[model samples]
Target: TTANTHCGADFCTWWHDSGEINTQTPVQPGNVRQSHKYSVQVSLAGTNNFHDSFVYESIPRNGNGRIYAPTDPPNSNTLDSSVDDGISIEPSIGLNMAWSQFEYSHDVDVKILATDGSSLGSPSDVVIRPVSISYAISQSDDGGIVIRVPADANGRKFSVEFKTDLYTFLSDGNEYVTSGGSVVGVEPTNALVIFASPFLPSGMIPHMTPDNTQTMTPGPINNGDWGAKSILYFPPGVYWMNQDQSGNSGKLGSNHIRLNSNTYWVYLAPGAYVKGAIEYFTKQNFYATGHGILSGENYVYQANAGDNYIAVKSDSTSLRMWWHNNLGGGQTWYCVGPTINAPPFNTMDFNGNSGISSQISDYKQVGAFFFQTDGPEIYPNSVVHDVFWHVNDDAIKIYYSGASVSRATIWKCHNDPIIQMGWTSRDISGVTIDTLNVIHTRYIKSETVVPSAIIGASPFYASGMSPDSRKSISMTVSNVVCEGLCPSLFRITPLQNYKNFVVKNVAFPDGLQTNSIGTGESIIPAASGLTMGLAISAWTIGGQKVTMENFQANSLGQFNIDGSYWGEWQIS
Candidate 1:
């Protein structure tokens, strides 16, 4: 199934077809397509057998022997002189991996031997795609696959490889890439590797090492809501739920404890508890800290006098909550924003438990906000409450990544819901939620900021940790509602150098008033951040009143734009 194709091109057909195969000749699943060598036990002869037609390539080297750059790289091995692994390769394979319409490369199964070697077929069909070598962060780590270097794209000299080929002796006849047994010294895959791309390359520090290898499961199992869940074996950060069951598809209740919704940041500690329903989704807009359901522990529910909004939902289109909850008596309820529904299905299930009870039928795409994440919480037992009863039973939909709120409610939109917010991020950090209300609902995408209920929003943290852990970037918010005329609110956003912004402040309602600003340039007073506090701006500037550091903002006051900015500022 693999070969080192340097003799003709297409990267030597993966270098002689990942080059490795041999046969005493009986492998009959169509005779290994042509010859043999595919393994979990056997089969790798020709035209696409098992491991689903193969694709994926990335393993470049430099400092001397292999860093060709362009001119010299084409010595002989040609598929246009080698290219497919992460396509063009930049900022260290674009930071960790990103360039998908759906697979640029993949394949593994070489076990059709005979000249002395055993295995001939169905040894689980001779599977192979698990390779390891190690060296980035280890101590008996429990799980494999780390691939580090992306805590916001550190250091810059990035390099990580694992796509070695030769189809295990070419179905037994053997000759692979000149035949060195298809090399295997590996490194990179620990830390879980993720780099979605922007070009990636501000000085170069891309690192990787799963060299403790052998864990390859990517592309096409195709069942959603938790069927074959994988972020390459989980571990983006955050793992709680000692209770909550229903994982691997138990259907529903049991305390449902499955996370890694591609996690970017999750704390949940304080006596932690949510054994019932704590589903999740991500595009980035989460943060909920403590006080109410006890701020996260003791089973759940304390944003202070805690009634726990009791209701939330998402399949995703928009959902954005932002409260820092520093706990002055902090009532609780986590889950910040973005997403709309889940369960058997959801289109606006006032009750019927998301099977979407006939409200007249047909809204079923089975939960489509954008695709999947399935938001909100309170499942199996420690009981937190939600799913409330019915009447468009409004699950959840609060968005503003780019900003376009025009009235929404039924928890931000179910029937006449139209709240949209999205845009703004040079380095990152943009949140603005001041006055909000939809008690029941209205306004589809109104204009005068809309029919007059409450709206003006935008929030995104797509990545995390930086209220100054040396500005790594982290932020959180929760089970939102916003009204009583909000004052001002902000999420973290420190780009080249300005620090300090930890605000959580949940339990919203006493006329809503909160504040923060490390002063480089200021403007955030639609009232204040609901409760929690902290905004230490910390020195310097460039334009519109202040700000100028994280990588060097041209002048929006020199560059300090931390999250949640409300109104006017005039300093000089």
Candidate 2:
């Protein structure tokens, strides 16, 4: 009966709120700090059509205390200022993550703006990674970067670009911020981009609204009927999914909502910011859709707070029901479009054989903390595609089974492999990874490029005393382009197993370079990695091709092709 906010201007009636609880709480400590350093505007290339580029804040977790610049820092404790457990306050915050999406072929012109009037600092300080695209990169004297994406660039769906250099003052973490407590650290800003498919595909979902539209229904578990299978719609707004409020009469619990039955549909509409977690306790079909943000800021991890990640998961240990039900209670989490930000636990985990037909397409994650949550653990035989991962652990995990990953762009700030396959010693099936573009890697521990990759008899690497598997493992990796500083290229060491490992179309677009962190360390894979386990194919470095004829001299004494396994060289 009333008039909409914008009847003639915008689609206001299409923007209705789904009746749900809005939990507003004091954002816990150790939470994320957003960056206002750079603001971006994405427009259809060569035209005036514009789109939105969102800049997200995060924690950098600087090694010891190497600070990043123009960032809001911390104050020293007055009583014992010099001595502290935390050198720089909130080394855990910044505007590192960014995202934007448009229909596949409608290319966009991205304009980077320094919101604080501060320029992008030094010349060429900002680099658009995986320079594999035909980007007409331009820069102005004011430190602004303009990137133009062409109209017909295939697989241009995902990437991250950032600023470089850090404050070398607190190199070893001993010193504290100066007399004035609130000191901003001198660390380089991280401006990343997660370009996703604008047009979403809906599966298993009967009711869904457009990205910019709304539905007033607050999910189905209402009216004292738990048997109903309906969708839970969250319209545009910031609501704490953990805290229970007036509209949560049907939700399972406060903070931790347990979907006890099958067919629980939770939809995060565009701009619907939800901060909490969900658990799948039965043989269910879980659908998480839309292009909104599902953050883990409200939940707690480690430090007395247990596992708070894996947006949706199930377990075998706690629920003896699995043993009772003869390994029956598993769910299929059909996810698409939603940007899962800083998942406190595994992005998606399942203990038993579940999610055979599950998929997470166009997935984007905020920076991940070490040991917090991995790409996708368990949930075997599923598919993940067009993912933007800024992680400290494995990009995607294959435990006890097989899965296919396509077009995954990664930015590793810690020492973890791109693919971690050795969770259980059981012989697995085929694993294929196509078009893996590693854009950035930080020199935290001993690792470079990828294939630091190793599969042990135990999960995540341990003393391998487990018995030999009765079966074998097979993997096919294609098109690996490391634009970042790649100290070592391949670490294909899967001990105590059989079968074949083939790597093809590899390229180090950035050429060979030393570690930017500390003494700039670089090392080769262990002796065990030299086993005839990996089959190598073509190679390209510094934008040029290198063949087997000249590999002995061009390999920099780093790669021992003599003992290392290879199927055979191509006709290069």
Candidate 3:
């Protein structure tokens, strides 16, 4: 290496060929389930004294080299963090970017000290976030059995001990694209690999602890009005919203707790399980984040008019049994951020005679509904991880709103869409699902397992505005890995004039495990697959046009749309 002076300095950041600089680049989908390694050359220029040249250290100045998402404004050191000088002189800094429960990427700032307390040249920067995909494990608060796997750099696969029968394993292997243009998987060749879930053998099956106690007042509790913007921390344990026996107790209690205050933060410690609904009505600057499980179990539904939102953890049969008998299945609702819920008079049809009626369908549902609250405005900086949803209806539904839904994995639900937006009833705008992993969709009515996506099909959705002139109602789905889905990968049934709509770097893995409908047994196909990769239907009965960019369906081919006004559609 010649005198490296790319920084326009008298001497380059002290480095030499004495040490090797190896970077293990990740494979397609660019996400690392294991750890990624980066070796920087360590040396000093103009002097042979390499021993006393430098000592490498991670951020916070003296923490592990691993980077983490910011917790506060003063601690805003994420992947995009910067410094005045970014040069360093050391024996070689070996930085390891490992998998984290936090969904977002982080910035690793390595400083090389000259033994005197001065940064050699500057703080060397390294970005270590989830490549394109990653994985996490949320131990049931009551179960308390932690399953820890080795670092990704250790090997290609690791065995995880879950319960006794569930001896599961995970793999991060190399992926290849065939000449016929299908993405295939191969054994790991390099240190870096993409994270993929291994199918359980025939003998093994999915199992979980049936929620027993809806203890009203659990240990390590935090209660009170979170009026101002404050981060309320709760250690790993159970927390009850109301008293133990009152309407606030267990499944018999109110399903949700309203957060009407402005700018509040709810932090759940790792391994924590909160069994209550947290609702925000007409609120702003709010954040409910954590690496814990928020359970909606044993909660009853009250559907008079204002009481509809509820969430419960029950099997598909139990949920259906309740649904058919006219019983609530933990439905929920919200009214935040100055929302409007009214039908336009122009869209209604009236008879020429005396019988006149203008009908407009109302939009409301259970399971994480956001009405009127814009995501960016409410949750600008928040983190939600390993969220387990066992509700009856839609798991995470956002209507006429906006926000960031990341690192959330939904499982064990009835026939409703896993994540949906903009029911034809109203328009949804400014939503971003940064990173999501939908493991399996359990539908009772259907035999085959259907894939869950941001479905845009609403019978009541009939927009009159042009796709161009309408307000900016956009959604961006990136870095997603969906498995156990049939038919289509991403479905857009009804059409809307969206501002920015794009889905990129999504991996639809084959050989997914599907939960059975009624009885029999859940089946894990020998080689799972998706029938239609991308499906879009733009009626454009009005002036709304459909445009997309940078969308791919790993091995499966692109889409075959029913309507639209265009963009690139290809398969690789």
Candidate 4:
């Protein structure tokens, strides 16, 4: 590198990657997910020696070397911080043309993790932060100078000076402001500075308010408090499950919440506006028969799409629950910042008390693609589990016709307790339920057996056949204690077609096993009996051995019921 004497004797800050200030390059698509390509450079001549000079670090703010300015303050070196981060730096660098030579690029957010080969919290130690720029005079194409001072460069009080080579004022070289000895002049690249301020509320349209104006309206497009949309930030509170149960729940006109009373239930017309959260809490449901929510139906909306989020809790003593349509099988919930719902980390834990309950589930297949339809769904952090358990007609469900739900988990429920379903209400293409926790009294339904959970289907489902016999039903039962006079813990019936059946890992303590052959082809033929596959139990009915092995002993049982050749197997 050559030095120009006309440049001030004090070498201005230059970001040749190794000088002073460090910043990772700006990433696009707003935020970066992984490593990208870029380079960094810093100046050699400064009060501090960056020469022998191994400044192994990340890109600096604005590609400028470190130089103190009154506007851009540094962080303090406090050791203990309970509230916000207390790490502070001395006021050393600001964005100015004098330091513009410090400009460089780096992979966004990638940690440098550099070491002098020893660790003791030294100057060569390491730390982390977002990023910043360093510069004073950045040059232009025509040999002119651009002046930049670091403050709020991208905000209301931001400005830059641009000079072109076409002008001859440099003949005297007197008008240029030099910092640390470097001159502000023309170069191939321009100087850019960015910082957030009025800080939090300034950049936002309607500014910061408790009731996010973006989601204030009930429909899409230009309406409501934010003019175009709202950014509602919700506080914590309880909400409604059914009309009788109460809490701070908000609903747009067409939004709905599904519940399982004596039967699968859907509240067709919700009569409230999208208030971002619930309002009045209800007490109880007197006329209702069942308790729980199913798939494809329950959802809390904020009037517009992608504008808001909600947190639901229970008002009851048992497991209080809210239902929504499928997470489109494999979709994720979105948020403005790192949210509690989506990736980076995926978990939902509730502090449940008597009568009150909480649960969250997402139906996603292996490759990380979600099912989509006309409405909102659940979110996932990848890591799918098998067997989702909750009390009701459908503790898990979806509506998108082609959506596929694979071995996911639904658990720890009340009411009718653990109900499991592979896919329901609509015709699904390739859904799978790997395993499940079917504890208390509940119904497990599905159309396939590869995923291995209690399975069922709609008698009039569009498949023209009952769920495939092989995948129609399966369950592994244990830790079960029930009354002697009640019905069996599990049952399987076909809605339309029949082919095969297989079940493994299940416990049947005191229930009767019967193979009733009906006249409908999808139902059963009067002559065929339920076949017994691999089992550890030797079971029989009417003196005829149903199973050749002791199925109840080893916690693994495979059973089959054939109805393929019967007159009831016809699709009429």
Candidate 5:
């Protein structure tokens, strides 16, 4: 139990978990939801060598599909997003992210089948998530279900909910057949596979320098490669990587392959595919991990200045940037990268890098442009856990300080709010978003659900930025799960007084089963709810249990509502 290495898929030629790249060879968040009704398998327990899970695809992009705001200022914004909407919005994705990796803490064993084997239905609560407790999940008779993994070294996710329920529709009584004969829009798929393990060691990928070797790439070395002029590694081929036309890497911008100094690490072994974006500025210690794929699909987005910066005036650009003292204030450095985002600009914005730290187990923004594509900006004592996202603006953001996010799984919820606590500069407190698992979202044309899933205030958010009033503050959101339909379950319009605010075991089953099984007229009017003085100190939805006197039946029994402000809020 001292040596370990498992590189399959014909020896990792840029693999997507043994299923060999799909969606017609697209790559970069490629569209490959090859789960025709759920199936996954991983092994490292006693070793039978089971492996087959690496599905990728999530199509959710938004901007003017509204949720409200901008009744003024030339009107039109609730987060905008459509500078040329990459390539038509006819792309439907049944939510996916089946990525796998194993390096250290091992005992892993998983299997979740069901292709034509049938019977994995009834009461099979998809297990292993943000910790509502009770797992090791078991079913398996002839159909499918089995899980045994809950010893994390910063990773272990296996959320597989497959029964078929995306838009799931069928109508003839009044016109909802919408497409072919059976007419079911995206299955009951909510696949999530992650078996990550790494306690230290993002090294040993330096040897390949004879036309860059072939196959055989594994590491568990010793000495720190710092002092490196550039120890870049990418084995399987296909690279474009840009930067420095004048964007200034004269040593200043320090990304896109670096020209001079900076870089003690950069390895993309598993069939490597680099299109661009990997940054570090006030560099001290930067560690980027791999399983392949680091892209921006050739970068270039300036739809009326949205700002990943090819020019929204200039640059603030990002796809991956850590230890960032980039061009602003504050300091503290050390970054570990895990990245992926297909079409143009998206963040890793530690804008001013305070207490600097970052590690994204995986970042996926499949197919194309979801404008501004931003996500990840936790600064001030950071510790982001085994992560995964299909990509969208603000997928777990923080400001002021105190950070913590654990085993995560995400897929497009469009416009915003997948955890955006107080934009920035308020008497901020410690932040924690635990075991999250979400699948699909976006029926939006905006009847107003104001893109909610934790957005501390927004009635046209205007906190003024930097009020400096910290004596005590807190936040804790626990084990969350969402299959579909989320339009405000918690908004909490900021004014701050939260000495402690907590919400537990949260779940969103098709917007609380709202919309009564689809076809309320071919859809498109994604809830308009929540907006009022906010407050929370112990709330739970779906399994029932919410406070402040049951809290509007898990909120409005029912356009959404938000705000209630807070003050000595404490409810364990």
Candidate 6:
């Protein structure tokens, strides 16, 4: 049994009766108009007592703070400024953290306490809105392009594009010109053109640290020494990944160096910027670690240029594309004009059992595509002020895995999940995505993009595999801070049983405006096979579970367990 009481500020009639006690304490005529603290001490028969109280104002104010519809008037009641913590109300205060809705800025407050004992609070206002900042980039006659960001838009999403024709030199109006013995600009005939935005100013070069030892001056050719461990040190200057020997027309620039051996490490100095991709075709145990920069030159183009797929393959074990404590800036995996119906220009493509392990503490790129991988671990550090995205593909797409993707701070993703799982016959046996901080996702008020950070499209039809071939999968998505107004938080659909999924600690502070917070296809096909049970928990501000069979959607039984506010379910 529950008993409720209120103070004069809300549900009280006695206190408004001349601000005096209704009993023998009735005030004398002279003392009647005095201020007093109102309180109620309710005690059950021979039990403990509970107290509720409030201070009294000289005269009562008449206003309603509750807002219902758009046509309704604004809340005329102003909050009391006397108590700092009393300005906001918690609708879910005693409801066992149940699902409740209120105006984010006015009705409630969200505060985060950091590890350092510093408190960060968000009142009814101060919510961040998604906006793109204006920037400018210009190209020199010599084919040099410079990018600059004039304003600070932390969550802005943008990409650069480079065309061969834009850089090609047409001396005789139509005919291409030659510098020495080679063409001046038909796709940068020798070295690749790359840039690291917001890098050290052009004229400023820092001393390089080679093997953590002596300092070396920057150079265009072989700056740092290659030591006993086969470690190549790149100083603070631009250098080609490898010298191009092919003189093929329109096919120029070699920004890729193949590491086909074992146990190799590439170190870059603090201000060093290498505009290229490291190719590890059939190799193992390689490390690319440094405080320097490695830019993929996503903004450059070369006709018939080999796809910067960075394919990792071998008949061997332990092949990896490892990076740690480095800044891997821009890369366009989807360059224009590939062979008709070509595979994507993935930032890194992994095949064979050799998985990729990246600490990519600092990175911003188009995509990271993995296939048939086992036990891959990728953590995009949310700090270092990193941003991640792709205009046309997923940020991270894995065909198969027992993987961990954590600490991702993502910006806009044009299409698909920021982290996508299971393509075709791919069995996503187990996966965990933790601490996904999505600041801005999808475009303005758009929902057709499927707007989700983690998604498993109806694996049945998505894979085009036989129902008998379906595999049971297990997944958990936790500690998600979905700041933007996205359509769905978790768009999952795996109709097979032996399935287990849990999503907890998800905050929809700015309540989702699109469809449901959690929306997906059903768990079992309609007219029955041997239906297997699925244990699923979706604790979101706007979430609902539905099942589909023969393309028809249906709901499973919903149960409200103890301490579970939204609810839990077993769908089949």
Pick by TM-score: which candidate is best? 2
Q: Give the per-residue lDDT digits (tens) of candidate 5, residues 257-333.
A: 43223444566655455555555553445555565666543333322122323323234443342224354343443
- Of candidate 3, the 10-residue stretch with the lowest lDDT total is 339-348
Between prediction 1 and prediction 5, which has the larger TM-score?
5
lDDT of 2 at 386: 74
lDDT of 6: 0.31
Q: lDDT per residue, candidate 6, 196-257, as tens digits? A: 12222222222234443333234222211222334445654443323332422211123244
**TM-score sort, best first:** 2, 6, 3, 5, 4, 1
TM-score of each predicted structure versus truth: 0.20, 0.69, 0.37, 0.27, 0.32, 0.44
Residue runs of model 6 more than 4 Å from their true location after superposition:
1-229, 240-255, 260-263, 281-284, 298-344, 354-392, 398-401, 443-453, 458-464, 493-498, 515-538, 542-572
Q: After superposition, how far is residue 222 of candidate 2 from its true place, in Å?
A: 14
Clashes found in each candidate (C-alpha, N, C closer than 3 A): 200, 16, 27, 114, 30, 4
- Write model 1 residue lDDT over 283-354, tens digit each, in one string: 332222211111011111111112211112222311112112121111222222112112211322111121
Point to the candidate with the largest lDDT. Answer: 2
Candidate 1 accuracy as TM-score: 0.20
Locate the minimum summed-lDDT window of 10 residues in model 2.
317-326
Which is superior by TM-score, 1 or 2?
Answer: 2
Residue pairs in clash, model 6: 105-124, 298-332, 522-547, 522-548
lDDT of each: 0.20, 0.47, 0.27, 0.21, 0.44, 0.31
lDDT by residue (333-433, candidate 3, tens digit) is 11110101010000001111221111111111112211111111122112222222222334455443445565544322323355554344334556666
